[PDB]
């Protein structure tokens, strides 16, 4: 624009002409002068001028406020409670529209992470993502998605458009590998197995109404229909759909990645995969 024309007229830019942005630096004040010297802002002789006032929270000898209030367990066990990041249907629809997630293929945590759709902190006790009903009315996509937790209304929205949603469990060690797979391959170790849910979480993941990954497949057809009746839509049949194979794809309950089995080694340097030939090893991984 016109600004660059000004440069042509003005003298050369050099190390003798530099200037900071105005107001970017304040002035630091030393106690030399009369305004800021003498008593130097500390007051008259006492404990505070000399520099030895009591600590924060001390009230002069009466029992302090933060210790006269009774103890109660608001934060008991906080470091052991499980955490799930929320993913709303507004956010999911937004991501598909801009092309940062590919709806043709199945969607799992790895694909969500790779598109910056979600940020996962395993060291802060994140165990995965839960689908949230907000934005359900305007969801107009057909997809295959796997999440750790789901809500009643969120499941309805996905399926009404002819899609599949399922709930799956990952352990702390597996979750770290899932989010950042490439650094694991650089280590040179075999892929580990996936542990089953703790005892308390077994009822949730073996229940059809939750779309669990360990529930009886025979009972799914009944559950899907009842949602259609309750929320007033017609249950579509996906077997007719051309993409039935994609929508039906599901991984083994002891598998982390779709096309890879426990016990394999990924040699990324020369694009090869190594498999063990020992019966004891094969039996261990397959169990």
């Amino acid at each position: 624009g016109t600004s660059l024309d000004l440069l042509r007229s003005l003298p050369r830019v050099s190390l003798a002409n530099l200037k900071p942005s105005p107001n970017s630096r304040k002035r630091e004040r030393r106690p030399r002068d009369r305004r800021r010297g003498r008593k130097c802002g500390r007051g008259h002789k006492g404990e505070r001028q000399r520099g030895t006032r009591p600590r924060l929270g001390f009230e002069g000898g009466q029992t302090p406020f933060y210790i006269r209030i009774p103890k109660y367990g608001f934060n008991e066990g906080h470091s052991f409670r499980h955490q799930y990041q929320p993913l709303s249907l507004r956010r999911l629809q937004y991501l598909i529209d801009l092309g940062r997630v590919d709806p043709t293929q199945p969607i799992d945590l790895t694909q969500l992470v790779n598109g910056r759709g979600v940020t996962i902190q395993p060291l802060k006790r994140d165990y995965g993502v839960q689908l949230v009903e907000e934005g359900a009315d305007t969801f107009q996509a057909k997809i295959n998605i796997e999440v750790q937790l789901a809500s009643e209304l969120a499941i309805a929205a996905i399926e009404k458009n002819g899609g599949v949603v399922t709930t799956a469990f990952y352990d702390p060690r597996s979750l770290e590998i899932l989010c950042k797979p490439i650094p694991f391959f650089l280590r040179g170790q075999p892929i580990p197995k996936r542990m089953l849910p703790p005892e308390s979480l077994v009822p949730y993941y073996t229940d059809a109404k939750n779309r669990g990954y360990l529930a009886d497949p025979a009972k799914f057809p009944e559950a899907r229909l009842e949602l259609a009746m309750k929320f007033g839509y017609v249950l579509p049949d996906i077997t007719k759909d051309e993409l039935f194979r994609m929508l039906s794809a599901r991984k083994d309950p002891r598998q982390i990645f779709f096309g890879l089995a426990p016990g394999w080694v990924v040699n990324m340097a020369d694009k090869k995969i190594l498999k063990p030939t020992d019966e004891n090893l094969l039996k261990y991984y397959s169990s």
Partner: protein
Amino acid sequence: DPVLRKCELRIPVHRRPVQAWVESLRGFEQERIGLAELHPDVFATAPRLDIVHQVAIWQRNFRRISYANTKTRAEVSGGGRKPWQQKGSGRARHGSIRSPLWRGGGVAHGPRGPTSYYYMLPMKVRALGLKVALTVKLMQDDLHIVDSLELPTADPQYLTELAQYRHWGSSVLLVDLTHEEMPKNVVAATSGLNSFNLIPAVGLNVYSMLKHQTLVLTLPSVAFLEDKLLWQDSRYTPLYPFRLPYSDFP
């Protein structure tokens, strides 16, 4: 045969490109041999001199370590005993001959040990500074795009006279694509000159551009610089260090 170059990357529709004369160094009079186009987003950014101030100061300060040191009253030799008793003497009260008040005593508030001044500016900010510096040289007519650095003779005097002939500055910075393949003739001529400096493309920095009056870029380096800087725009944040494998990044 005019040498005409086009930007490999997509220029924004609303921005017209900018151009400069291609030149050669083989002769004293081969000033113009071609016409070239330069991406507007690199060579036509807004003229921000505050950012140029920041990057120049970062370069000078992030390396600094000061080795100034002084002894406190604890580390000076001797001084353990109380010199005289509190009362009777009629002198001032004192407890050690190595306090700051005494000649030969310790320093109350002096420099302490080796100290570092390290800090890092955000990567996008440092990349922006390079674009602004390249823009400034072009708009002020201190940039000269050249096809190659080949020279007829290795005599240092020839290069100096050429700079006088073409109205260059007293100090010239010359950039070539890579260190290993730099032409033999150029290396011999520059090595004996204080003010004419030859560096590879990866060594370009804001501080050297300010120090040297005129910049000289070979055409292959222009494509090199354009690629790296424009990548900083339209990228994600890093999931992990970029040196690790990525789908589409070297």
